[PDB]
């Protein structure tokens, strides 16, 4: 029933959704999500925040939503998923376009 978290999906922002770092996290109980920008703490605000959009049982699909980002937001983004059973960690390179998407 209970299990360690697993980041089954983490990719660079797509053409249709340029301001979102997409992810899929599995875990039981709900894993705590934490981001790192080039190894440094990413303090979440109204400009850069985590939002899980679809919650299907032990599956969590969401984005690191960025509001009007520039080249100053480009870099290495590490997502860490933890619960009391384990830890999973995956990283991506992000390059942000000046338009939301197509």
């Amino acid at each position, epitope marked *: 029933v209970h299990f360690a978290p697993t980041i089954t999906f983490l990719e660079s922002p797509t053409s249709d959704h340029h301001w979102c770092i997409p992810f899929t996290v599995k875990g039981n109980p709900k894993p*705590a999500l*934490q981001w*790192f*920008y*080039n*190894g*440094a*703490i990413l*303090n979440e605000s109204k400009y850069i925040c985590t939002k899980i959009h679809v919650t299907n049982h032990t599956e969590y699909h969401g984005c690191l939503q960025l509001d009007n980002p520039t080249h100053m937001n480009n*870099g*290495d983004y590490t997502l*860490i998923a933890k619960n009391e059973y*384990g*830890k*999973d*960690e995956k*990283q991506i390179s992000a390059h942000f376009m000046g338009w939301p998407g197509i």
Partner: antibody, heavy 116, light 113 residues
Framework: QVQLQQSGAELVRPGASVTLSCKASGYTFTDYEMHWVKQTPVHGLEWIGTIDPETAGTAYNQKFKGKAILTAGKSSSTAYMELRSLTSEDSAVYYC?????????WGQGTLVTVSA | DVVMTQTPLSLPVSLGDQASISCRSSQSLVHSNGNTYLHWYLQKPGQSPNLLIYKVSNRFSGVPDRFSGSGSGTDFTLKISRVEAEDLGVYFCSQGTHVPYTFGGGTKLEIKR
């Protein structure tokens, strides 16, 4: 501004105990891991243990078990490390550091001199 | 306990040249989650250690292009292309894979003159 502010230098007599503090600011202290590191010229850098301030859950290096005790003030945003039954082997610079497997944030260090 | 052997202990290198620090683990640093938690730090005299590279090759925010890391499993390297005066200090390797987390002995960078 992520800042780890450590308490001042301590001069403690052998056999006594000292409590070292580390004020964390510029982030949500309770959401991240806190680590303590010891530096000596002979042994170099040694990892003491780690605390998760939300759950108060600890993990220690076997060689610091019973010597060091890690606690966290949740409302105060402060990490504490107690050093018991002090010896000359406990005279070192102690560092509070975070916030994951890599240590991007370090305090200025606390010098602990163990002498009569 | 994982032993981190750093070689050499002292590294003499002329200004503008390249320095090469080696860190050797006693056990594989690949975690079950798939990550290799090998980090590099620089401790300038009188100061607290500073992070240079996290997870074998990733440069920490603000670290110059000149610093680069490589390796896998047990053998690892730190390279500083075109060494500067501010690069002076002790270079440490660290592992965050196995508990207790361990640090290497340190490599003191020396400017040859």
């Amino acid at each position: 501004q992520v800042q780890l502010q450590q308490s001042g230098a301590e001069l403690v007599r052998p056999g006594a105990s000292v409590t070292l503090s580390c004020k964390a600011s510029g982030y949500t202290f309770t959401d991240y891991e806190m680590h303590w590191v010891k530096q000596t010229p002979v042994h170099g850098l040694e990892w003491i243990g780690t605390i998760d301030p939300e759950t108060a859950g600890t993990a220690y290096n076997q060689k610091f078990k019973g010597k060091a005790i890690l606690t966290a003030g949740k409302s105060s945003s402060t990490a504490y490390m107690e050093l018991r039954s002090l010896t000359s082997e406990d005279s070192a610079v102690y560092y509070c550091t975070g916030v994951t497997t890599w240590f991007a944030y370090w305090g200025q260090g606390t010098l602990v001199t163990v002498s009569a | 306990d994982v032993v981190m052997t750093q070689t050499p202990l002292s590294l003499p290198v002329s200004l503008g040249d390249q320095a090469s620090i080696s860190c050797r683990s006693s056990q594989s640093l690949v975690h079950s989650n798939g990550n290799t938690y090998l980090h590099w730090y620089l401790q300038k005299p009188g100061q607290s250690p500073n992070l240079l590279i996290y997870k074998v090759s990733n440069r920490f925010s603000g670290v110059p292009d000149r610093f680069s890391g490589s390796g896998s499993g047990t053998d690892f390297t730190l390279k500083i292309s075109r060494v500067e005066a501010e690069d002076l200090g002790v270079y440490f390797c660290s592992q965050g894979t196995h508990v207790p987390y361990t640090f290497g002995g340190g490599t003191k960078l020396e400017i040859k003159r």
